[PDB]
Amino acid sequence: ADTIVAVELDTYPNTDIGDPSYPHIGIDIKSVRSKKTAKWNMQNGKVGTAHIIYNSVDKRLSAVVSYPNADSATVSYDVDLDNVLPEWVRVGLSASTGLYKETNTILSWSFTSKLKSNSTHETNALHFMFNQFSKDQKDLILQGDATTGTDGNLELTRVSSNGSPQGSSVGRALFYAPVHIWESSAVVASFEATFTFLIKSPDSHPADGIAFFISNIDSSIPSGSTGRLLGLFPDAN
Amino acid sequence: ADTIVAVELDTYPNTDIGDPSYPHIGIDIKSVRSKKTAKWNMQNGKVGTAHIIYNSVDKRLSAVVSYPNADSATVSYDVDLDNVLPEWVRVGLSASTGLYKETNTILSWSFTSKLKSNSTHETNALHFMFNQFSKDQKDLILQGDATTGTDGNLELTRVSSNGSPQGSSVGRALFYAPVHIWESSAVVASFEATFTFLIKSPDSHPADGIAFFISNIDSSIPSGSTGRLLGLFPDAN
Amino acid sequence: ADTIVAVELDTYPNTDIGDPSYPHIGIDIKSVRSKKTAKWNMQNGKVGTAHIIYNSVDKRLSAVVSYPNADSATVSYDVDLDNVLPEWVRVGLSASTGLYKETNTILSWSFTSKLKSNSTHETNALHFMFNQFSKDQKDLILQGDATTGTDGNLELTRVSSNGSPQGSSVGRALFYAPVHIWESSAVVASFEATFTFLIKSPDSHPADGIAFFISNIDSSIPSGSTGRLLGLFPDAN
Amino acid sequence: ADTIVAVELDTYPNTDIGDPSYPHIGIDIKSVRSKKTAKWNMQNGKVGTAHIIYNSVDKRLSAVVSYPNADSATVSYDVDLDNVLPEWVRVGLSASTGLYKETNTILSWSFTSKLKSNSTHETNALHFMFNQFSKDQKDLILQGDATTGTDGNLELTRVSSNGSPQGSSVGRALFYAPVHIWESSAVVASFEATFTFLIKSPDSHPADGIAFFISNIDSSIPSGSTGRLLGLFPDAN
Ligand SMILES: CCN(CC)c1ccc2c(c1)Oc1cc(N(CC)CC)ccc1C2c1ccccc1C(=O)OCCOCCOCCOCCn1cc(CO[C@H]2O[C@H](CO)[C@@H](O)[C@H](O)[C@@H]2O)nn1
Ligand SMILES: CCN(CC)c1ccc2c(c1)Oc1cc(N(CC)CC)ccc1C2c1ccccc1C(=O)OCCOCCOCCOCCn1cc(CO[C@H]2O[C@H](CO)[C@@H](O)[C@H](O)[C@@H]2O)nn1
Ligand SMILES: CCN(CC)c1ccc2c(c1)Oc1cc(N(CC)CC)ccc1C2c1ccccc1C(=O)OCCOCCOCCOCCn1cc(CO[C@H]2O[C@H](CO)[C@@H](O)[C@H](O)[C@@H]2O)nn1
Ligand SMILES: CCN(CC)c1ccc2c(c1)Oc1cc(N(CC)CC)ccc1C2c1ccccc1C(=O)OCCOCCOCCOCCn1cc(CO[C@H]2O[C@H](CO)[C@@H](O)[C@H](O)[C@@H]2O)nn1
Ligand SMILES: [Ca+2]
Ligand SMILES: [Ca+2]
Ligand SMILES: [Ca+2]
Numbered sequence A, B, C, D: 001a002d003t004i005v006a007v008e009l010d011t012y013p014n015t016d017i018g019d020p021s022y023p024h025i026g027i028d029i030k031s032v033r034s035k036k037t038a039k040w041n042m043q044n045g046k047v048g049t050a051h052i053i054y055n056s057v058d059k060r061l062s063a064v065v066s067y068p069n070a071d072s073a074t075v076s077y078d079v080d081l082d083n084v085l086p087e088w089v090r091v092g093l094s095a096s097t098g099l100y101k102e103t104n105t106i107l108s109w110s111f112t113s114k115l116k117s118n119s120t121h122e123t124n125a126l127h128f129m130f131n132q133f134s135k136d137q138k139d140l141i142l143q144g145d146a147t148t149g150t151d152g153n154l155e156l157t158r159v160s161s162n163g164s165p166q167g168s169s170v171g172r173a174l175f176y177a178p179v180h181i182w183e184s185s186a187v188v189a190s191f192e193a194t195f196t197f198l199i200k201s202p203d204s205h206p207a208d209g210i211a212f213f214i215s216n217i218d219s220s221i222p223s224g225s226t227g228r229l230l231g232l233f234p235d236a237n
């Protein structure tokens, strides 16, 4: 099974797996049961932004979700990445729907990672930025239902021709190249990621959420990981 | 008087102002008496690197100092920059010597700052990088004894023609343009800074240290701020 | 006198001083009389983009101006910068109106310069990016009529309360820090600039245009440079 | 067959297939027979730098190779990339030896590509930077003899235990992710690459050279491309 570190934008409260009773942002380290969460005032059908930061100086993973002219939602947690992830990973975005549903559209996505070795400026870096997705996006690995459309967006879960979202859907997009996220001779290892997202639901109740995740390089969608498992976890433990 | 947030590389223990009894790295918020410190195994005449990071998600200022093939020194502290600094600042490097002395040579210096407003990618950024300093470095404001040499380095305190450092010296270099470090409509405000430094002492005992600081835009060297005040503070309170 | 290198987006044909008979983009080297122009299909009231690039490998200054879903306008010219400019300069945007008028609204401005010396990676760099402008934009030097308004835009030339543009106006905006654009010991020197702009006019003929420029650091608006001289030049020579 | 665009650092004169009579740098478009060359004063056993740049504004591919404190070698050529390459490519470095030999050691490699679509800032980008290479460099595709060693370097061609270079060797290294180098809807498409290199030879005549190249994504070393074909081309046409 895979090793997952994720930040979750969770739109549907599953309280029997420890979700608080409201939509929330959370930090997940090898379990869907978040290590920390914060209340998130999710807004149905408005474009929002998420920003995930990590530095190995403070060993703290932090995230903010906001919408224009709204208060932000923020969460942070101690994370020693050398203790949780292999040296090489892939990075991605995942989303699901279950019995309830929502569009999980990504409008842009950026990532940067930097690894300063032993030496005085001996830095390796990777940066990518998608402000538009093409129909053939060859630097994305799409898993499950995820697709990139002729409209320039990344739809992580299934949406019908009339634009309405489907239940029981799960899909992911991982940057194509593996990422060196830590190295034992690194003075500073750190990364950041941002994406813009549009979650819309005809339901009164949207489900299930979108997550930015970092995984083993060979990570695939766990069987039956629709609904509350967000495409990331094989079970609710 | 000025408002100062600094990270100090303190080579000389002044225990009557709360220095621990060894060279140390520290975080200074409006006082020379560090809010936090860590033991620093300073190495006389070897090139070292310092890395300072801040993000407004976790509101944590962190720093690492290291030398190649040595263990690092690290410190972190809660810092709400909107509560400590004006919206606009200058950024700089400062150093001093007192009754004891040392070269305070800077071999390179980089900074980046980013301010994401209200909106989805509404980001302002500034980046500079000096990997060599010229004799006329017009984007640096030099204060006190600091100079840039024909050898490509920034000498913050006074060094004689034979290369030996002088006592009772204080000098600073601030990037020329003011920096927008926070804004009340910012989702994410953050910055990073790195410099490489060479501190050499013929003494058995080096003094006094080098600091990366952020100040009010009109900051100048406080009178008599040689020795333990590191060019940053008008008194020891 | 000032020393000016500039890319002009010239909306008004001044045929008596060398302008082709149509709106055009031009590369201007120490004279309002463009070294090279291309036909520019300027679009009243639509946001356009301009992109200016230079590298010392080819020593070719090029520019492209475009609108979504229209054909681009492009111009290129030999220029040895060590030949025309001082080593240190400022960069800026300029605009004017005269008898005829237009808004000269700047919605974003990015610039990046790099200067690689003698050595194998010994590169200095400056980058700044404005995706919104505040009311007190301290890292800009505003000259003449230029203001940064409540809407988050930079208005280079005077705009009335009702957003309508005014005649005989001239304004510039310069980045605060000087920029090191060449050095005799650089293996590669190079820069790019980008800005988005909104030129709108109640008139039949808009005037007079917008330019990105590079100048001696102490450059000011020459006297009598409203209208056809675009805030850049003292006369039409 | 592969489709190759490449800048060659050609240390060995193969005059019977079009080489000038001296070591040279060259711009190669779908043939080992360079479209444009310049005289290259290659220096045995000294670290050099190469810098390759392209922009779709001028559609000029240029390159400069230099050593500290020597004159630079420079070459430039018209190239419409939508004309020669597929929309998606890989990038890489290639090198070979034949009867004559040299180390083809890479100490650092940086690359940045940007593709600005239709819209006012709708830019996709990729950047990667290697200032050291590890033993398992997972984001490189190594082909032929190429290895990443214990010294932190990439050895493109076979080097013995005692650091001495071997004959009839060929190796390449490609960045793992495909790169989107052009798109019919881009206002500006552009890239730069830089690498530092150490070519050393016990021989009187070093051979055969190093190249930075761009290829179809499924490019492999053509058969029989050791020596004068630089690991890039199946024949000398
Ligand atoms: C298709 C028509 N729809 C859509 C209109 C449908 C059908 C059935 C239910 C529905 C909706 O909603 C609820 C809601 C609750 N709540 C609590 C009072 C409110 C938060 C409780 C039960 C249901 C049922 C239901 C009733 C009776 C028997 C079984 C189920 C059932 O959901 O079994 C389905 C899965 O079971 C495995 C999890 O086991 C522990 C869950 O603890 C139970 C609490 N619960 C279930 C759910 C909904 O879960 C599904 O939908 C979620 C939203 O997409 C996913 O997160 C989740 O993985 C699953 O797909 N939420 N809380
Ligand atoms: C020029 C020849 N030199 C260099 C060889 C010289 C001359 C005098 C001293 C010297 C050195 O060293 C010490 C060391 C100590 N230590 C503790 C047992 C060891 C850590 C105590 C006294 C001295 C004196 C000294 C003895 C008698 C009377 C006065 C002073 C005196 O330093 O007055 C000078 C300043 O006073 C104001 C601060 O007031 C509270 C300090 O608490 C006292 C503890 N102290 C002083 C010092 C040194 O401070 C100077 O040098 C530092 C290093 O550059 C600076 O950080 C500092 O601001 C000051 O310039 N370090 N700890
Ligand atoms: C396009 C319609 N035309 C052509 C029929 C036009 C428009 C205005 C005047 C014109 C002609 O003629 C004169 C002549 C005089 N004379 C003296 C008694 C006799 C020489 C005085 C004023 C005008 C105006 C005018 C009146 C009121 C207020 C201001 C202006 C004005 O600024 O004129 C321009 C400057 O004059 C000096 C020489 O005069 C002819 C120059 O070139 C002749 C053609 N011309 C003038 C203009 C507008 O130029 C202004 O606005 C341009 C667009 O904003 C700017 O590029 C330019 O720098 C200037 O601000 N454009 N083409
Ligand atoms: C520079 C001193 N010269 C000129 C006096 C030289 C050097 C070697 C041979 C030469 C001549 O001639 C022959 C001739 C034959 N023939 C068949 C019985 C008769 C045609 C066989 C082998 C050689 C070698 C040689 C012997 C042992 C092992 C390998 C080689 C070798 O690879 O030759 C090269 C390929 O042959 C095919 C045609 O033959 C002449 C081609 O062009 C003639 C001039 N030439 C050859 C070479 C070295 O070329 C190799 O090394 C270069 C540098 O590494 C590579 O660029 C090239 O791809 C090849 O790997 N350079 N110029
Ligand atoms: Ca949930
Ligand atoms: Ca001290
Ligand atoms: Ca004109």
Ligand SMILES: [Ca+2]
Binding pocket: D010, D011, D012, D013, D014, D019, D208, D228
């Ligand atoms: Ca050759």
Ligand SMILES: [Mn+2]
Binding pocket: A008, A010, A019, A020, A024, A026, A032, A034
């Ligand atoms: Mn949750």
Ligand SMILES: [Mn+2]
Binding pocket: B008, B010, B019, B020, B024, B026, B032, B034
């Ligand atoms: Mn201290």
Ligand SMILES: [Mn+2]
Binding pocket: C008, C010, C019, C020, C024, C026, C032, C034
């Ligand atoms: Mn003109």
Ligand SMILES: [Mn+2]
Binding pocket: D008, D010, D019, D020, D024, D026, D032, D034
């Ligand atoms: Mn050749």
